[PDB]
TrEMBL record, chains A, C, D:
Name the record gives this protein: 3-oxoacyl-[acyl-carrier-protein] reductase
Domain named Ketoreductase: residues: 2-183
Family indicated by similarity: Belongs to the short-chain dehydrogenases/reductases (SDR) family.
Pathway named in the protein's UniProt entry: Lipid metabolism; fatty acid biosynthesis
Residues at the active site: Y147
Biological role: Catalyzes the NADPH-dependent reduction of beta-ketoacyl-ACP substrates to beta-hydroxyacyl-ACP products, the first reductive step in the elongation cycle of fatty acid biosynthesis.
UniProt keyword terms in alphabetical order: Fatty acid biosynthesis, Fatty acid metabolism, Lipid biosynthesis, Lipid metabolism, NADP, Nucleotide-binding, Oxidoreductase
Gene name as annotated: fabG
């Protein structure tokens, strides 16, 4: 079984992606922010995956995790960079930390993990790098300058890497979710959530499985001629 | 008869044929259209139990209405519509005639307007629908001599966004698939050298295949793409990245 | 004194463009839909322009008008294709004539007039084709499928023609207005117009002079290295 | 006079921008990487500007420079963020420092300087933030993942900030140069430079003045209804 690495697989979009790639036939290593989180992933995946703890802000941990996968399971041939943490603020309340942490978790992590898996994909002459971006990289809102800059940077990074790796048949793409229902949108008010769905042409929030379906498509042999693109999964919230 | 009905225009060969065969594999009853009766019979022969062939000149409103009415009477409402046209009439602007302009805009863009309009009722009633328009990399990646084809394909993509907004509340999705350089009977006929200059522009360093486009259409037509609408799915091997 | 042709120059954006290009030093031929309209343009422009009647749906009139300009004033070296007529309708209610007329007035006219001025620009080693597009070619809303398709077609047409004419230093660009105040938006309600400006980051409708400023920039020697682009003038209604 | 701050004004695009804004009537503070560089700027600008040394990687220096301008000349009402340094490499050879330094010089500097000038623009009910991006944020090439990600991040940052500041009539835009002739491209071979111009529809490299013209347009009252956009100045190298 080819190995897929899905960061942030504990819940929501990351969990749905990891479960779908298992259904597709991959051996899935999912990462969590803690050891207890990783054990819960290990329990859930059984025979067909493994859970590992990973702080994606940490280069040493990134390297230790990929080395561990290589030693125990095989080369990482599908990499899904999945982060959703936000630190929103209007610009003159947006601190240095709020800026730096979001750029590090989202964009620097994509640079570091993509770099680290290139060797094994190159040797296999097969690879899928699939980056979770956001509608926000294209549909501007106040208070999200750091998240928006990080996600747009990810999409541009992906285009340049797609050009570098294309001749060896490795594809590099992004999936850009719109408003996806999560445990915290469940926590929002009824009214705030309606204000969200009224902007969506399909008139509803999406589900984590919608994003997992798009990632599964790109990771499969049905998408072997797609590289350097953004796959928008937002119900018509943003159309391009 | 009891499967959902898909209508694929221009299904005789290449991308259209691959789309029609893939949607049959997916479980749709596929009506494919050809430019002549003998072409339609060959589609009928190929599809058997799981589709039908009909002759259709997509420049003709009367034929568009007769074909969809025939499908409604004999098979069911059109719930997946794939608008597929590939004819070109390239020329630098100084040599591009009124006919060269009008015919390309009519075959590509007007046909999308007419056929989309005609299937809206049945999709609305079913509260399910997929309209999938075959666009082109050329709507975004400019090159000389294609002003009519490029304008038509870009118009299709903008049309699709408008219609996606109109139909979204009824869960009908409207999307485009934009092929890059796809190998066809006609690129097979080109020289070795001309075809190399094509693939050297592609990041994956090869021409695509009709099945690559069929795979993308199949994805969008499925329940795996129910939250995707108003988008362009680029299938060009990195020839154009957006 | 170089000749500029501005279609639909009677009022609004077209009038502001024509007056600005006169200030810039061009001899401006403006067109109107009737002879009395053309005479009003002639009166307004005086020494520095002329008014002509032109139905842009008519190839014979397009040819007669450009030939008349060539015979009496000089080659058309700046062409501004300006049309604003709409025939909005949900697709259900959008007739063949509503579709055909909008595509003919907006997109076919750009094809016909651009084709007709190429010779003189080619011979002069200088040219500006500036097409008035719209935010609507990019920012989708229901009921405008014909207008949106026509404007997007214009932008794609312009890219192809920019590639064809670039070696001879002729530039081909589009200007895409957002919500611009007109006699027609003056007539709307107070509430409807507020519902427009609240979507604009600058929190106001634009003015015809804003579009004239953008056209003037592109028509000048300050924009000689800009071709095949869309210049968005929408106050942040749409950002790309 | 209103004060404009142009970073990296010693040569090339930055120098042309600074000289053009002086011609437009601004008092221009230009920055250089050293004190001797700043003195040269002071000598060149005379009565109509000043030179200051600034390492844009340094928050303390950014704060000291803007405070110095506020104390001696007036509020910064036009900010031009101009950086061109590259640290290209295929991803396996792209070090942590190559990534971090480019993201800091280009994108973090835009965040820090934009944040620092917001107060004075807000108080004046007038402002222009103009960020020098690049064609590379859109036209992917191998070996530039860091530069491309930084420039795309700048464009997304600008859209978010344009939404935030729009009601106060402050505009935030980017100018994206293509292949512009520099001291650097003068040094390239004849053949390599031809490889560049053959990709340009206008069949030539641009000049620093072409970028200065675009910045001058956006900084003027001729562009008061343009915000959150990218102005592409690339001769048709990339068309959108």
């Amino acid at each position: 079984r080819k190995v897929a690495l899905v960061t942030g697989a504990s819940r929501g979009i990351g969990a749905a992606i990891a479960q779908q790639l298992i259904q597709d036939g991959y051996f899935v290593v999912g990462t969590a922010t803690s050891e207890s989180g990783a054990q819960k992933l290990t329990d859930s995946f059984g025979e067909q995956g493994a859970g590992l703890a990973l702080d994606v802000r940490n280069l040493d941990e990134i390297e230790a995790v990929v080395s561990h996968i290589e030693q125990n399971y095989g080369p990482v041939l599908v990499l899904v960079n999945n982060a959703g943490i936000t630190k929103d603020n209007l610009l003159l309340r947006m601190s240095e930390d709020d800026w730096d942490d979001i750029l590090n978790i989202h964009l620097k992590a994509v640079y570091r993990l993509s770099k680290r898996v290139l060797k094994g994909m190159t040797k296999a002459r097969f690879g899928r790098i699939i980056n979770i971006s956001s509608v926000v990289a294209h549909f501007a809102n106040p208070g999200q300058a750091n998240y928006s800059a990080a996600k747009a940077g990810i999409e541009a990074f992906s285009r340049s890497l797609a050009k570098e790796m294309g001749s060896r048949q490795i594809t590099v793409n992004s999936v850009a979710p719109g408003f996806i229902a999560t445990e915290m949108t469940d926590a929002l008010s009824e009214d705030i959530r309606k204000k969200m769905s009224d902007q969506v042409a399909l008139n509803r929030l999406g589900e984590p499985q919608d994003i997992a379906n798009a990632v599964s498509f790109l990771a499969s042999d049905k998408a072997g001629y797609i590289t350097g693109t953004v796959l928008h999964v937002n119900g018509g919230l943003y159309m391009a």
